[PDB]
Amino acid sequence: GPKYTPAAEKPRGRRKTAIGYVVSDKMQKTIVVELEDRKSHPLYGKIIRTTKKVKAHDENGEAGIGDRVSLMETRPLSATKRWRLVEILEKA
Amino acid sequence: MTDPIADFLTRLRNANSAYHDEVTLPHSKLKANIAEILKREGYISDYRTEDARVGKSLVVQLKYGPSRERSIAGLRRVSKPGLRVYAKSTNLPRVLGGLGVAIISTSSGLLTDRQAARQGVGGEVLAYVW
Amino acid sequence: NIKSQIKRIRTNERRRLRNQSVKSSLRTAIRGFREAVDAGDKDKASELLHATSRKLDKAASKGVIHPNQAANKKSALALALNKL
Amino acid sequence: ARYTGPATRKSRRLGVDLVGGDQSFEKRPYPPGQHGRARIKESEYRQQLQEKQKARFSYGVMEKQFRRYYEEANRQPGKTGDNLLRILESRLDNVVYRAGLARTRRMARQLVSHGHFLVNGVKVDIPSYRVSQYDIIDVKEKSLNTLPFQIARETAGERPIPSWLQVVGERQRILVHQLPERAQIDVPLTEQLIVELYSK
Amino acid sequence: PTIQQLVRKGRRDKIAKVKTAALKGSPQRRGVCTRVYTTTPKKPNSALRKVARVKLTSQVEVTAYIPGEGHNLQEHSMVLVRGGRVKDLPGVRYKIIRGSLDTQGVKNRKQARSRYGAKKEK
Amino acid sequence: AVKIKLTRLGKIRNPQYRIIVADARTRRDGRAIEVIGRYHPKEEPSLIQIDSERAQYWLGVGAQPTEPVLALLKITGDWQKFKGLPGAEGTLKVKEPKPSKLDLFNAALAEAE
RNA sequence: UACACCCUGCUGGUCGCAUGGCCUGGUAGGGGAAAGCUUUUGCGGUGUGGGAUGGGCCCGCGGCCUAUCAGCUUGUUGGUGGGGUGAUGGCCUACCAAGGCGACGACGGGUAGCCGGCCUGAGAGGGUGACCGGCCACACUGGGACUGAGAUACGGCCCAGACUCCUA
RNA sequence: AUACGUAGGGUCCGAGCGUUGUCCGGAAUUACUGGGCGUAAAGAGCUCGUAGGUGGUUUGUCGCGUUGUUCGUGAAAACUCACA
Numbered sequence: 005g006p007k008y009t010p011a012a013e014k015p016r017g018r019r020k021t022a023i024g025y026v027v028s029d030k031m032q033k034t035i036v037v038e039l040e041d042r043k044s045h046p047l048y049g050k051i052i053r054t055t056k057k058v059k060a061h062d063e064n065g066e067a068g069i070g071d072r073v074s075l076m077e078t079r080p081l082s083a084t085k086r087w088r089l090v091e092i093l094e095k096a
Numbered sequence: 097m098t099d100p101i102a103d104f105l106t107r108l109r110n111a112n113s114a115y116h117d118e119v120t121l122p123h124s125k126l127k128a129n130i131a132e133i134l135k136r137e138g139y140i141s142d143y144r145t146e147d148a149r150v151g152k153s154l155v156v157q158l159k160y161g162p163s164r165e166r167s168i169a170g171l172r173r174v175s176k177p178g179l180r181v182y183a184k185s186t187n188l189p190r191v192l193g194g195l196g197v198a199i200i201s202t203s204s205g206l207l208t209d210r211q212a213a214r215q216g217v218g219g220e221v222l223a224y225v226w
Numbered sequence: 227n228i229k230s231q232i233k234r235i236r237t238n239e240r241r242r243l244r245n246q247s248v249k250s251s252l253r254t255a256i257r258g259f260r261e262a263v264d265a266g267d268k269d270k271a272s273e274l275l276h277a278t279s280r281k282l283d284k285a286a287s288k289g290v291i292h293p294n295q296a297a298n299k300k301s302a303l304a305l306a307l308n309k310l
Numbered sequence: 311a312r313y314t315g316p317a318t319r320k321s322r323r324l325g326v327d328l329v330g331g332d333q334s335f336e337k338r339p340y341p342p343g344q345h346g347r348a349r350i351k352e353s354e355y356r357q358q359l360q361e362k363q364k365a366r367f368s369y370g371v372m373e374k375q376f377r378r379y380y381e382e383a384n385r386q387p388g389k390t391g392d393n394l395l396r397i398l399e400s401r402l403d404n405v406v407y408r409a410g411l412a413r414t415r416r417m418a419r420q421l422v423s424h425g426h427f428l429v430n431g432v433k434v435d436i437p438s439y440r441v442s443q444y445d446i447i448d449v450k451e452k453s454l455n456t457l458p459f460q461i462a463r464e465t466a467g468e469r470p471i472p473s474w475l476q477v478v479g480e481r482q483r484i485l486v487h488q489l490p491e492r493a494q495i496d497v498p499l500t501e502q503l504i505v506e507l508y509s510k
Numbered sequence: 511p512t513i514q515q516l517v518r519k520g521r522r523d524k525i526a527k528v529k530t531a532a533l534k535g536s537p538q539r540r541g542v543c544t545r546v547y548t549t550t551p552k553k554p555n556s557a558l559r560k561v562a563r564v565k566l567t568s569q570v571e572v573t574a575y576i577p578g579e580g581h582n583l584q585e586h587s588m589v590l591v592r593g594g595r596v597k598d599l600p601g602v603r604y605k606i607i608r609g610s611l612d613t614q615g616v617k618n619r620k621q622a623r624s625r626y627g628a629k630k631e632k
Numbered sequence: 633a634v635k636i637k638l639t640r641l642g643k644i645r646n647p648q649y650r651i652i653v654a655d656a657r658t659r660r661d662g663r664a665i666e667v668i669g670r671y672h673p674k675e676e677p678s679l680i681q682i683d684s685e686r687a688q689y690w691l692g693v694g695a696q697p698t699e700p701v702l703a704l705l706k707i708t709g710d711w712q713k714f715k716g717l718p719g720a721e722g723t724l725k726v727k728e729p730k731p732s733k734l735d736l737f738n739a740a741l742a743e744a745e
Numbered sequence: 746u747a748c749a750c751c752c753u754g755c756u757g758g759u760c761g762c763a764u765g766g767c768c769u770g771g772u773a774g775g776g777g778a779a780a781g782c783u784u785u786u787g788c789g790g791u792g793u794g795g796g797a798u799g800g801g802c803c804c805g806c807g808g809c810c811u812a813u814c815a816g817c818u819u820g821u822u823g824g825u826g827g828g829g830u831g832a833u834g835g836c837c838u839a840c841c842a843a844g845g846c847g848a849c850g851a852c853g854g855g856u857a858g859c860c861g862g863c864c865u866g867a868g869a870g871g872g873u874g875a876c877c878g879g880c881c882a883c884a885c886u887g888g889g890a891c892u893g894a895g896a897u898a899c900g901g902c903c904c905a906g907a908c909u910c911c912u913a
Numbered sequence: 914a915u916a917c918g919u920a921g922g923g924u925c926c927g928a929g930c931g932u933u934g935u936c937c938g939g940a941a942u943u944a945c946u947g948g949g950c951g952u953a954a955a956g957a958g959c960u961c962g963u964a965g966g967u968g969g970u971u972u973g974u975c976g977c978g979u980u981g982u983u984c985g986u987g988a989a990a991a992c993u994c995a996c997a
Binding site: 511512513514517518520521524530532534535538592593594605618619620621624625 | 931944
């Protein structure tokens with residue numbers, strides 16, 4: 005038979021992507037983004053709404069304070085920075 | 097002031113209980129449809145909306161039979177603020193074991209227990225009257 | 227505790243002792259290539275990169291270093307030559 | 311396992327026929343002892359306890375085997391009162407007794423003790439054996455030729471065979487057909503008290 | 511009551527109300543008894559009840575009752591203490607098993623015949 | 633590597649076996665990747681019921697049955713499909729026909745009357 | 746000798762998740778192996794392409810208590826370039842910058858392996874991780890290293906103590 | 914003294930039968946289901962307001978919450994139904 009036998013494409017993607025607001029675009033190639041949750045309480049039923057301060061990598065510095073942006077998770081790119089700013093749709 | 101629909105139901109309860117044969121109300125579409133379905137199933141006599149303070153006003157006549165007896169048995173908002181309530185297609189509660197009727201604000205609009213059971217969508221129930 | 231495998235003890239001592247000299251020699255060659263590249267001489271760097279791409283590839287074919295560490299070092303020295 | 315005492319004293323205490331034809335119990339219907347005459351502090355507790363004790367002592371069944379009867383009856387889809395009476399009317403010794411082939415409950419108890427019966431071809435020395443519908447039943451010849459068992463089989467003028475049991479030949483073949491039905495059992499005092507008490 | 515305030519905090523039970531304190535909730539412990547002096551029960555129940563104070567192996571010093579009529583235990587005895595509840599006596603919530611490690615069963619006990627360490631009559 | 637194994641089940645005196653596929657480094661009763669058969673020496677015909685085509689796949693990728701597992705494979709004729717040397721045929725025996733639940737009482741009634 | 750493979754220089758096409766991915770891309774330069782025994786059912790060796798299964802890393806979410814525990818934080822955070830690693834990544838390291846974490850409870854004190862489950866309870870709920878199963882951690886103690894595809898290496902090793910034993 | 918102790922005599926259970934230890938429910942005795950706070954437990958001495966929760970009438974959007982649906986999915990045993 006052929007010397008070379010081929011491989012597969014392992015359908016890949018769907019890295020977690022969500023809409024956040026840039027809030028601490030302060031450090032070089034670095035932004036901090038926040039998210040919203042709306043979850044029914046396990047016991048009572050009072051839907052609580054909380055947040056989360058993810059750290060994202062901006063190689064370009066496009067974002068800024070209070071911008072409605074989107075983020076996809078990457079490979080771990082540093083100690084607490086695991087997000088890629090893509091599909092920006094609001095500033096300020 | 098926090099809750100308008102609870103005050104709607106409280107006024108219905110007091111006015112019917114205190115033997116009044118009518119009640120007047122501001123006309124926000126929510127309570128409008130609540131009283132609309134109420135007369136639809138016949139726990140009240142008839143509702144009519146006219147013009148008032150900047151909005152409009154709905155006036156509700158309570159159905160009383162041969163004596164001063166109310167077809168309404170009672171009213172209680174369930175999906176209140178701070179405890180808003182959602183329900184699904186399967187476990188659609190049966191009011192008074194199924195005797196009564198309820199309000200369930202479906203994604204397709206507004207439906208009761210039996211209607212939503214015949215159809216099968218859920219998401220938000222409200223007060224029930226029996 | 228002694229149980230029917232001191233032969234493994236001697237085997238592992240030998241296996242980890244040969245790699246000591248092998249790794250010392252390879253690291254000395256790599257450091258020499260480092261002085262070649264930092265000195266700014268490109269012919270010596272090219273020849274040392276050639277020799278080390280031979281040597282570390284041999285060592286990876288042998289049982290001293292995993293295949294990919296050798297490729298990493300080969301690429302690093304190759305770029306060090308390519309830019310000097 | 312097995313109890314020891316006779317049935318006359320328990321008959322008198324519980325105040326019901328446990329032998330069925332106990333001459334001495336009707337001779338002394340009051341409970342045994344110096345104070346069977348003395349009136350009891352009546353309680354529905356006593357009513358239910360008397361009911362369950364009559365049920366236990368009538369068939370030769372015994373208490374721990376009796377509790378699991380109620381538990382499995384409650385596990386059944388039907389109402390527990392029906393299921394308990396059905397299963398208590400579904401015992402191997404009960405099946406062979408209602409055919410009129412044993413003059414006493416202890417008759418069948420000691421018969422299954424000895425191994426004088428056969429269900430579907432397998433010998434079961436276990437009175438707690440369950441006999442299903444359409445089971446083939448037979449009696450061994452060693453007991454068949456025994457004199458008192460000859461009397462029991464040939465003078466079987468005892469209680470009639472219920473519709474769910476059918477002795478269909480000289481081989482004492484009790485070709486069971488259906489379950490003991492509530493409309494067919496003709497049970498002694500009911501068991502709703504047992505269900506209500508145990509459920510609490 | 512302020513569902514949100516429940517989310518903030520709340521909904522804990524009141525108090526354990528512990529009963530046994532020998533140790534480990536032990537079905538029984540063993541130890542050395544002392545101070546076997548008899549004290550007085552409540553005035554309406556005028557009598558005198560024989561008790562002792564036992565230092566159990568659990569390294570706690572508790573008060574045990576001596577049930578029955580006769581006793582076998584004395585000072586420096588390997589008494590097996592079990593939990594009990596004697597409302598007739600103040601602060602006495604223990605007993606010592608008869609027919610056991612140290613204390614011989616109560617002599618000629620026949621109404622109980624299992625308690626009080628009364629073995630089977632031959 | 634990978635091996636097709638017999639794993640033990642049932643109570644003490646009567647053994648039963650599930651034909652599983654698993655790593656060697658596991659134990660006799662580890663997490664089965666897939667149950668592909670079952671077998672019981674205790675029952676009369678040593679009756680075996682095997683998921684066939686999954687075994688075909690696993691033999692294709694290189695599953696290596698245990699010695700009695702391989703014996704069972706031959707007992708099925710499954711080893712005559714992946715290897716396919718003579719072709720696959722029914723090799724295992726079967727439990728005897730035996731009467732039914734209803735015909736027993738039918739015959740009993742016929743005998744009685 | 747390999748070019749089946751890897752590294753580099755350039756470059757064509759192609760899919761994109763941005764790093765990039767695919768054409769054993771190509772090109773050109775460079776480099777990388779092996780085995781015998783045995784007649785004997787034959788067993789065996791090297792390299793690569795693929796399966797299979799075993800894995801290694803990261804993340805969503807779930808599940809102790811205690812401010813009579815409210816500040817914590819400098820390799821901490823981000824970037825850069827490297828060292829190192831199987832691969833990412835302050836993992837490490839030189840510089841740069843000052844961030845980052847918390848009342849939606851940090852940082853502390855105490856406490857505990859955890860789940861399929863099991864048991865009670867009508868239900869919710871509550872209590873447990875017996876055994877049978879699923880993983881993890883640990884194998885005088887504490888530090889260190891080894892090898893192999895793979896090591897807290899329980900019946901592998903060294904070093905610092907403990908303890909014990911033998912002792913010229 | 915039918916309560917003690919003793920005898921019968923009776924109740925029940927049975928190779929068991931009682932005692933201790935622990936957990937759940939009964940307890941609504943944490944009251945989400947399913948509690949209260951004038952006199953029984955419970956409105957700080959009184960203000961404002963950060964955090965937080967929390968919302969008037971009405972137009973269009975989004976469908977996050979929420980619901981509807983397809984599928985992957987939740988080892989075996991679990992536990993149950995049904996069969997042997």
